[PDB]
Write a protein that binds this DNA or RNA. Structure first.
Ligand code: CLM
Ligand code: K
Ligand code: K
Ligand code: K
Ligand code: K
Ligand code: K
Ligand code: K
Ligand code: K
Ligand code: MG
Ligand code: MG
Ligand code: MG
Ligand code: MG
Ligand code: MG
Ligand code: MG
Ligand code: MG
Ligand code: MG
Ligand code: MG
Ligand code: MG
Ligand code: MG
Ligand code: MG
Ligand code: MG
Ligand code: MG
Ligand code: MG
Ligand code: MG
Ligand code: MG
Ligand code: MG
Ligand code: MG
Ligand code: MG
Ligand code: MG
Ligand code: ZN
Lengths: 119, 122, 113, 53, 207
RNA sequence: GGCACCUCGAUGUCGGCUCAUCGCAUCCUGGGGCUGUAGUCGGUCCCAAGGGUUGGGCUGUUCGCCCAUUAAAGCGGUACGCGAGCUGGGUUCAGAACGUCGUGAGACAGUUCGGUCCCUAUCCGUCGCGGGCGCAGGAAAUUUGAGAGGAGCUGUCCUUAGUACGAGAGGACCGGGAUGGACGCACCGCUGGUGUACCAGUUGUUCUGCCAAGGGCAUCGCUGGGUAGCUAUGUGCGGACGGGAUAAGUGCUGAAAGCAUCUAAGCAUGAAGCCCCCCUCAAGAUGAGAUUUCCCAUUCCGCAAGGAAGUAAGAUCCCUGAAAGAUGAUCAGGUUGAUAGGUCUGAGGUGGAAGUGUGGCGACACAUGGAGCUGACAGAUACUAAUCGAUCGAGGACUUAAC
């Protein structure tokens, strides 16, 4: 099983890709708890490609990650950060690259929010 | 799986070329016939010359199906077509010859005459 | 793959079968028990399909017999098969050759490898 | 389909027996001492599991 | 009567000696323990209480630990009674293993069927649909609730509701193989329930 | 049909569809008597309502006729059952036309072509699912079964036996055995279906600067496959053996009534039916049952009665989830933890990645290499999240009897 998150197949993929790149860039995002729970598996699978490091793994990641600037100073893309900084940080760690922390409901819709961050 | 309205090719030289299934025999509310089962059928297309003629109500035994048959050893047989053979009430073929392969299941259902006349029995 | 299910059924896996793939032409030597006698009937044809795993793995072989296409599906590890000879290795581009069901003659031919 | 009869005050009240909020699943924060939801970050001090988030 | 509790592992298939392919359910039944003997004197009826599947000590409680103390065994996850057994054959603490059964023996198999959740009258009760075209606005509805005269619906007008999750017995299944080493029964055919669910295997009541 | 008693501040009307349920005057199957019952078939009447009781052609039809089956194709009731469940072909609005009648407007149980079917369920009722309290302490399990529901159908073939029977023709009972139809229950190992976060091919355009490799959109763009799950057309199994009491029927012994007589006393036999046997629910069965095990008699007021407060065993909140699920619930777990994710190794699926090299003018091919990729499946692994906590929960009435 996997969550649908109230979106069509394409909308959901697009959202998970957006969130995946957001977490790579920011290292810590706030979203709905259920979005965060789906994002764990997707992001950790991207980090696995990063840790592999080979061209084939990079092109697989490039099919998923958005073309967004990670570091404006260095002119580093999100894909480049994944294969440089993130992959290096989690060289010795075997899985569990993210953690979710629950924040409680937001005002407008009572939606249970969460921080998801790189460990 | 042959039911009422299913058309079959005729795998013999009896005259009939195509039949339409009127009835699957062998019980009230029986929907489907398979290889070995007898059907009542009308001849829709006939060879102009032969014994069996167009519009005749005849009995026929199903010798090949697309749906096919399962065997006790876990193996299956399937054909590319649904085909039958026009028979008498004593299960003898009205035609003299059988065309194309037939299933081994005909031996189990006591259609030895058709099995004997068939070019291949699979 | 429950290891338990493999371990129970490992005894009945045949070791003598050749490596074949969909597209390859086989001679399947099928043991037929017509009453008393146990004769062998060869089914020569193209492997259109191979599915499942372990003891539940099956394969389907297709041949044209007296102008009528015939398919026989077998369990891979059935003791009813005496022998499988690979006649000819095929050059195909997919696991399931269901497109062959429509074709006939030169269109239905497969390139040898 | 419409109400055949109006609902009495009693029956309305009986129906609303279960139409009720529960008390939040709350515990004292070990950092700051304000109540927080169990398994959630404390909104007051930003702590969770003895760590500032 | 004989019986044993096991878990449903799953299904596979076995080639018989004659070359027939038999579908089998694999039931793993690690040795059951007789926890209690109920008697006509004390309980008003004769039965043995079989315990199956060793639970962790944390997951057990003091009531459970005291109950299994006479049998001198760990607390058991699944506890069920067998009636119609020979009381003198069993003793409290005795192991009941899969080799009580042998290949060829005819058994009844009881389990809880798989849950389907809230299901409509077509799926739940096998009812017919109304037409899908020809102006129809009647597809998967449950049919007339009944005649006018009663001014009420009769009991047993079948309707949507929770389907499955019910105790089911399948009768007259054959034991194909008994693996005493691995604590397995291979039973011909299919039995109720999800994988990992509790299956009771008993000698067939109609045999 | 008669009558005009309810309804004209509306009780929708034929046929079909969906769902049935009841009666028995029984269509089939079960048991019988009589027969102008040789046998095989039948006829007729009796008992019997357990289950079963078909697909089509024509017609709006019901009905009916016909085709082909079937053990049989029962007859009726339930607002000619069922339109706040469906349909709307017919009937029965407005258009138009034919025949006919009418000077005419028009009209016709004459015909013809076309013609809006509304409603978010309050209550009872029905089907599921929770919460509460009860059940003289508080708990965790296992249970008895008052009671209730389900199931209940039947063919063909072989054998007995070409025997009994019969001039032949034909051809049994009773009893064995095999295998179906329809129906039901379960399940996905098999055959298939689906499978919108699996794999591959491919068109147009657009973007990642370009090549190469990819992304977006076009029904999942389209096409070919397909894992788990859910599934039938797939597979397994079921209605088996019986027992008790009966119906019609058959009697035994037997008088009233020297005889006779199944009946008055007495004693038998005997149906698919009844009650069990089989399957499921079930102690709110307030008549609240039973068994096993656990906790253990605390601290306060208040004269006591009783109340209040911490707790025990135990359970919950909250959290990780799925074999469960609308939500509750259920079930697996909550760190001496494999509950989920990730990770690692597999299974299965796809079918040969990218990069590089080689061959070719090139499309492309071959090699590296059953490769690469891989939701849900299996195992292992505390890397991530199941943190810290909080709440609830006994101290057991009286009487009598026996110890
Ligand atoms: O007239 C109606 N129904 C009346 C009650 O008001 C009644 O039920 C009725 C129905 C049909 C009928 N007929 O077919 O002659 C006569 C009266 C309305 Cl439903 Cl339109
Ligand atoms: K009226
Ligand atoms: K009946
Ligand atoms: K209507
Ligand atoms: K109404
Ligand atoms: K009411
Ligand atoms: K399947
Ligand atoms: K009780
Ligand atoms: Mg799209
Ligand atoms: Mg972004
Ligand atoms: Mg394969
Ligand atoms: Mg229908
Ligand atoms: Mg519709
Ligand atoms: Mg009433
Ligand atoms: Mg009248
Ligand atoms: Mg009057
Ligand atoms: Mg009114
Ligand atoms: Mg009667
Ligand atoms: Mg009516
Ligand atoms: Mg109505
Ligand atoms: Mg005139
Ligand atoms: Mg009129
Ligand atoms: Mg009872
Ligand atoms: Mg009651
Ligand atoms: Mg599977
Ligand atoms: Mg499948
Ligand atoms: Mg390009
Ligand atoms: Mg665009
Ligand atoms: Mg009790
Ligand atoms: Zn705090």
């Amino acid at each position: 099983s996997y969550r649908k998150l109230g979106r069509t197949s394409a909308q959901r993929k697009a959202m998970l890709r957006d969130l995946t790149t957001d977490l790579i860039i920011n290292e810590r995002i706030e979203t709905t708890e259920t979005r965060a729970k789906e994002l764990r598996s997707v992001v950790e699978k991207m980090i696995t490609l990063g840790k592999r490091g080979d061209l084939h793994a990079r092109r697989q990641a490039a099919a998923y990650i958005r073309n967004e600037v990670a570091n404006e100073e260095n002119n580093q893309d999100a894909l480049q950060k994944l294969f440089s900084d993130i992959a290096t940080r989690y060289e010795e760690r075997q899985g569990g690259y993210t953690r979710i922390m629950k924040l409680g409901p937001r005002r407008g819709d009572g939606a249970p929010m969460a921080i998801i961050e790189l460990v | 799986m042959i039911q009422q309205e299913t058309r079959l090719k005729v795998a013999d030289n009896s005259g009939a070329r195509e039949v339409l299934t009127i009835k699957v025999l062998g019980g009230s509310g029986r929907k489907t016939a398979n290889i070995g089962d007898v059907i009542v059928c009308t001849v829709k297309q006939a060879t102009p010359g032969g014994v069996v003629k167009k519009g005749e109500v005849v009995k026929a035994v199903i010798v090949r199906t697309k749906s096919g048959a399962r065997r006790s050893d876990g193996s299956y047989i399937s054909f590319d077509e649904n085909a039958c053979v026009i028979i008498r009430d004593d299960k003898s073929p009205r035609g003299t010859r059988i065309f194309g392969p037939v299933a081994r299941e005909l031996r189990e259902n006591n259609f030895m005459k058709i099995v004997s006349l068939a070019p291949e029995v699979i | 793959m429950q290891k338990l299910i493999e371990d129970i059924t490992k005894e009945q896996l045949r070791t003598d079968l050749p490596a074949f793939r969909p597209g390859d032409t086989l001679r399947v030597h099928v043991k037929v028990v017509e009453g008393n006698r146990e004769r062998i009937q060869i089914f020569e044809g193209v492997v259109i399909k191979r599915r499942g795993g372990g003891i539940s793995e099956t394969f389907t072989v297709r041949k044209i017999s007296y102008g009528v296409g015939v398919e026989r599906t077998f369990p891979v590890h059935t003791p009813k098969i005496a022998k499988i000879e690979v006649v000819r290795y095929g050059k195909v581009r997919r696991a399931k050759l269901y497109y062959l069901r429509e074709l006939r003659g030169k269109a239905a031919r497969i390139k040898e490898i | 389909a419409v109400p055949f009869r109006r609902t009495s005050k009693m029956k309305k009240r009986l129906r609303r027996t279960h139409f009720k909020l529960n008390v939040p699943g709350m515990t004292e924060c070990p950092s700051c001492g304000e109540m927080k939801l169990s398994h959630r970050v404390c909104k007051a001090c930003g702590s969770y599991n003895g760590k500032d988030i | 009567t004989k019986g044993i509790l096991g878990r449903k592992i799953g299904m596979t298939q076995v080639f018989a000696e004659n070359g027939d392919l038999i579908p089998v359910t694999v039931i793993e039944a690690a040795p059951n323990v007789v926890l209690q003997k109920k008697t006509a004197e004390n309980d008003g009826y004769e039965a043995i209480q079989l315990g199956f599947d060793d639970k962790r000590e944390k997951l057990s409680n003091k009531p459970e630990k005291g109950h299994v103390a006479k049998a001198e065994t760990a607390p058991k996850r699944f506890v069920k009674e067998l009636r119609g057994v020979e009381m003198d054959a069993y003793e409290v603490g005795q192991e009941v293993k899969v080799e009580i059964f042998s290949a060829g023996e005819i058994v009844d198999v009881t389990g809880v069927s798989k849950g389907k959740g809230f299901q409509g009258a077509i799926k739940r009760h096998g009812q017919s649909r109304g037409p899908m075209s020809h102006g129809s606005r009647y597809h998967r509805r449950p049919g007339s609730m009944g005649p006018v005269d009663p001014n009420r619906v009769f009991k047993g007008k079948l309707l949507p509701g929770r389907m499955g999750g019910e105790q089911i017995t399948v009768q007259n299944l054959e034991i194909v193989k008994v693996d005493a080493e691995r604590n397995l029964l291979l039973i011909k055919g299919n039995v109720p329930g999800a994988k990992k669910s509790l299956i009771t295997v008993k000698s067939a009541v109609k045999s």
